[PDB]
DNA sequence: CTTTTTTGCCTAAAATGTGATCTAGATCACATTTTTCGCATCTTTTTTATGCTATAATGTGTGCAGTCTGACGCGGCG
């Protein structure tokens, strides 16, 4: 509490992390380590630009 | 009687046979230097498990079915 900010922001970071890599861990019959996942995100975004 | 063809001789001559006596060849079972191979180090080198980011954010549906149907079970349904 001492930071004096709204609590929502905090776990809005934490959860986001948890989700963001739990789907990447699971969610496939093929496991893909995170590094490929990241670079795939790079790819997909930059493709569109 | 003359020719030619043949053989045997002359006359020159190569091929055959003495075996006794060595002499460079090849064997022959077992020790040494080279290949470059295989598993332990390093030793990097890359890759991978794990860890944070402090404005703020508060109840789904999500795209579909086109609804077969006749008999029989079974829970109701009275």
From Swiss-Prot:
Annotated compartments: Cytoplasm
Domain of life: Bacteria
Entry's transmembrane regions: none
Entry's family note: Belongs to the sigma-70 factor family. RpoD/SigA subfamily.
Domain free text: Contains 4 domains, connected by flexible linkers. In the active conformation, the domains are in an extended conformation, each making extensive interactions with the RNA polymerase catalytic core. In the autoinhibited state, sigma-70 factor domain-1 packs closely together with sigma-70 factor domains-2 and -4, contrary to the extended conformation that is seen when the protein is part of the RNA polymerase holoenzyme.
Oligomer status and interactors: Interacts transiently with the RNA polymerase catalytic core formed by RpoA, RpoB, RpoC and RpoZ (2 alpha, 1 beta, 1 beta' and 1 omega subunit) to form the RNA polymerase holoenzyme that can initiate transcription. Identified in a complex containing RpoD, the RNA polymerase subunits RpoA, RpoB and RpoZ, CRP and DNA. Interacts with Rsd; this prevents interaction with the RNA polymerase catalytic core and with promoter DNA, and as a consequence, promotes transcription from promoters that require alternative sigma factors. (Microbial infection) Interacts with Escherichia phage lambda antitermination protein Q.
Biological function: Sigma factors are initiation factors that promote the attachment of RNA polymerase to specific initiation sites and are then released. This sigma factor is the primary sigma factor during exponential growth. Preferentially transcribes genes associated with fast growth, such as ribosomal operons, other protein-synthesis related genes, rRNA- and tRNA-encoding genes and prfB.
Name of the featured protein: RNA polymerase sigma factor RpoD
Gene transcribed to yield this protein: rpoD
Shown chain mapped onto the complete sequence: 421 to 469 of 613
